[PDB]
Design a protein around this nucleic acid. Structure first.
Length: 231
DNA sequence: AATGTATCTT
DNA sequence: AAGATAACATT
């Protein structure tokens, strides 16, 4: 039963996975369950497909693609988002800094819960959906690729924000003639250390948020109100 | 000043 | 698979 695939029903329908692939996903989830007896995996099993519960597949406006979940216990299942009682991590600080600098009426919030963006059509996905406490480069690759390939062919006029070189590698999956693809180095401060001589654009000054909104406005779609967050 | 978060090259 | 890099906001 599709209950074991942990995906929200709208997604289980949209993606329309084959029997073969449903068994490949079920085997991976059972492998992660086994791993949890030994080591600690983030996020918890229940919160793996959290991004699928917030965001409806047909409603997607922007696709933000990260590297992998946070590894200090703050991963929520929705990429780069933290719990409202939880302290905003460095990566999320950099995102809020670029929003402050670019978006006109934006003001950085006290809380880091991006649930509001998902309800607005922002898919916060990572290339790998799990992490060992304190890397799972494991076998998620195929599924996150399947999601991107599925969004790119089924939906029209979406924006794909790729951050870091693990995200950038997904570039050939997106149909450039149908959607907008914007690439930048990862928001993490460590991305300013490695890749100081990088040919890829720096996250600081990338202006992805306004650029995405201009594309949506141009294609007569509703914009993302980035500033619509707690406080 | 010390600390805690990728990218590239081998 | 793993080590050098010497960024930078926050503490």
């Amino acid at each position: 039963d599709d209950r074991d695939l942990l995906l929200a029903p709208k997604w289980i329908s949209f993606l329309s996975l084959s029997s073969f692939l449903k068994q490949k996903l079920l085997s991976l989830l059972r492998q992660i369950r086994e791993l949890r007896l030994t080591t600690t995996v983030y996020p918890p099993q229940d919160k793996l497909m959290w991004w699928s519960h917030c965001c409806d597949p047909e409603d997607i406006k922007v696709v933000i693609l990260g590297q992998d979940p946070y590894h200090k216990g703050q991963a929520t299942g929705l990429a780069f988002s933290v719990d409202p009682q939880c302290q905003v991590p460095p990566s999320l600080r950099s995102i809020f800094r670029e929003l402050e600098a670019s978006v006109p009426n934006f003001s950085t919030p006290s809380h880091g819960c991006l649930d509001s963006w998902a309800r607005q059509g922002v898919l916060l996905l990572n290339t790998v959906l799990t992490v060992e406490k304190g890397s799972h480069e494991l076998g998620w690759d195929w599924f996150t690729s399947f999601i991107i390939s599925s969004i790119s062919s089924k939906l029209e006029h979406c924006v794909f924000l790729l951050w870091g070189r693990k995200a950038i590698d997904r570039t050939p999956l997106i149909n450039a003639q149908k959607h907008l693809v914007l690439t930048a180095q990862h928001p993490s401060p460590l991305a300013s250390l490695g890749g100081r001589h990088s040919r890829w654009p720096r996250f600081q000054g990338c202006n992805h948020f306004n650029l995405a909104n201009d594309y949506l406005t141009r294609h007569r779609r509703e914009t993302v109100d980035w500033g619509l967050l707690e406080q």
